[PDB]
């Protein structure tokens, strides 16, 4: 373990000069070993400091908490001699060690079970994985539940805007809450090679570099996909031998409706051609029948055994139903926005995707998709939802197929 990771494991112990504190904030870069030592240190602290008490562990969703935190935490605890009994249906664990036993309830920031349970339960310590991605209403409610004598608060996240509730309320008022704060760059994880560290550097440019590599709380302003480059990302519209295929779709009778034909060739997805229909501009809105008829004329040429399905947003259920009637494979897209943008940026940085030069509406949109300046100075990083109709399709595709 690194010096900073070992400070997370030991701050709470009796010999430590900082064991006074009411809690701890660990933030900074990706792949820095924050979550894994933080969650491991939390259970150690709890099993040592208490007996027969309730504890909380929160994530964006409970399934997120389970992927990032809970599954690798079990192998860690089981290996150190901590017996765990996971009660998967009821969302809590029973960790037990040297005659002592405690209870660790699992929470989601958005979940309905989690609002119901958190309001009533009375905890002796709370932990937050990806705290910036959680509602502030949730953490204020959950911190009040830490009523038991000698409770400690643990927070864990990557950076966001400098006007974000957690940065402004929790991190700037650090001495006011008597919280400890360690900040993790990627050098604080010794398990990474210098070869592997510099690979992660190449995945991010711009705001996302400063946030997810340097660990800085910097402001999302101006153009979103600034790293897009018509030198690097545009290729000629000349045929190629594509292995698999997809069609990505942003649907709207009300606004423009887009398709995009994506094709795999030499481990790179090419946006082969675009469909762009604006009902307002054309002054004739299209029906689902008319749109389905267009998707067929749009994929007439390609070979149906390679065509692997249509990625489409869940709020087009009128359209989704008709495609399944007619017998098309229809993937409900991973809708999450900031996570989709960040992943598309990575795809451009690494050239996982390229564009044929006939995606002319896509390039226009690349040069106008900008951050909501008004919202970003509240601590809410969002796109301005205007001329983002190809880019939403491109986002669904990249997020749904390319990334996990
Ligand atoms: N002591 C260790 N031995 C081996 N691998 C480790 C060790 N500490 C951390 N790692 C690995 O380092 C990587 C990052 O650890 P995490 O705790 O998941 O990072 P993180 O800081 O939570 O990253 P984000 O912000 O959630 S992407 C994982 O692949 C871990 O398995
Ligand atoms: Mg983490």
Residue numbers in the entry: 14 to 417
What do the authors say?
A central component of the motor, large terminase, consists of an N-terminal adenosine triphosphatase (ATPase) domain comprising ASCE (Additional Strand Catalytic glutamate) and lid subdomains, and a C-terminal nuclease domain, connected by a short linker sequence. While both domains are involved in interaction with DNA DNA translocation is powered by the ASCE subdomain using energy released coinciding with ATP hydrolysis. The nuclease domain is responsible for cleavage of the genomic DNA concatemer at both the initiation and completion stages of viral DNA packaging.
Consequently, a protein construct with this segment (residues 418–427) deleted was used in further crystallization trials. Structures of complexes with bound adenosine diphosphate (ADP) and ATP-γ-S provide the structural basis for ATPase activity. Firstly, the side chain of R44 which hydrogen bonds to Y213 from the lid subdomain adopts different conformations upon the binding of ATP analogues. Secondly, the hydrogen bond formed by the P-loop lysine K47 with side chains of N169 in the apo and ADP bound structures was not observed in the structure with bound ATP-γ-S. Instead, the side chain amine of this lysine forms salt bridges with the β- and γ-phosphates of the bound nucleotide. Likewise, the presence of the γ-phosphate causes N169 to rotate its side chain to hydrogen bond to an inner shell water molecule of the catalytic magnesium ion. Superposition of the structures for the full-length protein and the truncated protein (with bound sulphate or ATP-γ-S, respectively) positions R421 close to the α-phosphate of the ATP-γ-S. However, similar to the observation for Sf6 large terminase, the observed overall conformational differences upon nucleotide binding are insignificant.
